[PDB]
């Protein structure tokens, strides 16, 4: 419902998140996905690695140049499995796949905006516990994406800065959240409690 949702990938799956992000594009809600590294998939790391490689052996015989390509940075794997679900031939899809912006991590200025999640794609809810799964950043690192170590280094930066802010804010709130207690019990407060708040 926001003009632009900033959606988190952590703890989600692909197929489910992909589908949803898609349809939301086709209805015209802009989306910026973030922290792609953190994405998950059904199946152990083996099975997924195999399916990916079995996608690495699909090429074009006369020349590879316009034949099947292969992509690594998790943003691009997600992006793939998503774009398969949009009709990108027509001008509808191409007008949609412009509304989608995937990242890895949380680049500015999306750190400072509230992230959201998709409750029907979360792993913790969907998958039955005690059953294997896979993290994406791993898989993509083992298909040749090199930058994983950097990503951590950047988040271990953000998360620190994050933790500072979240501290001070909470601290501030303790004033207001306590302050209200004196404005309580007064007449006007009695009413606002009687009028349903």
């Amino acid at each position: 419902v926001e003009p632009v949702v900033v959606i988190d990938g952590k703890g989600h799956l692909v197929g489910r998140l992909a589908s949803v992000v898609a349809k939301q594009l086709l209805n015209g809600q802009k989306i910026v996905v973030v922290r792609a590294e953190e994405l998950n998939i059904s199946g152990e790391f083996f099975r997924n690695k195999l399916k990916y490689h079995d996608f690495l052996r699909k090429a074009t015989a006369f020349n590879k140049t316009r034949g099947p390509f292969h992509f690594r940075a998790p943003s691009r794997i997600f992006y793939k499995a998503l774009r398969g679900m949009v009709s990108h031939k027509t001008a509808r899809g191409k007008a949609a796949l412009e509304r989608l912006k995937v990242f890895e991590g949380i680049p500015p200025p999306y750190d400072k905006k509230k992230r959201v999640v998709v409750p029907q794609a979360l792993r913790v809810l969907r998958l039955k516990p005690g059953r294997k799964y896979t993290t994406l950043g791993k898989l993509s690192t083992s298909v040749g994406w090199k930058y994983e170590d950097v990503v951590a280094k950047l988040e271990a930066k953000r998360k620190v800065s994050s933790a500072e802010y979240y501290a001070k804010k909470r601290a501030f709130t303790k004033k207001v959240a306590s302050a209200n207690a004196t404005a309580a019990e007064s007449d006007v407060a009695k009413q606002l409690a009687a009028l349903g708040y």
Binding site: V1, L26, N27, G28, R92
Partner: protein
């Protein structure tokens, strides 16, 4: 006030269609806040107005409108079929359609 909106907002989606043949008589509308048909039943019959711009000033104002009603419910999630007078362009799938509140019968 700050917010003068008297109309629920919404999204245009598709024309009604089979898997192949569409039927661009009746646009299908998504409404914000309606998740369920029995929520729709309230809205059926209001006046939808699709509003956009034209760079050539026509009547002395560049904002144009198509009007139309909202006829019946669609699907369990609360899509609602609306039919305008001049069918929506199909240039706009997923563009913001405004649903006013009147005829008002409660």
């Amino acid at each position: 006030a700050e917010s003068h909106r008297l109309y629920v907002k919404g999204k245009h989606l598709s024309y009604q269609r089979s898997k192949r043949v569409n039927n661009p008589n009746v646009s299908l509308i998504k409404i914000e806040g309606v998740a369920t048909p029995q929520d729709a039943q309230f809205y059926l019959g209001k006046r939808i107005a699709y509003v956009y711009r034209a760079s050539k000033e026509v009547r002395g104002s560049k904002i144009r409108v198509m009007w139309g009603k909202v006829t019946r419910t669609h699907g369990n999630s609360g899509v609602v079929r609306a039919t305008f007078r001049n069918n929506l362009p199909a240039k706009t799938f997923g563009a913001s359609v405004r649903i006013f509140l009147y005829p008002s019968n409660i």
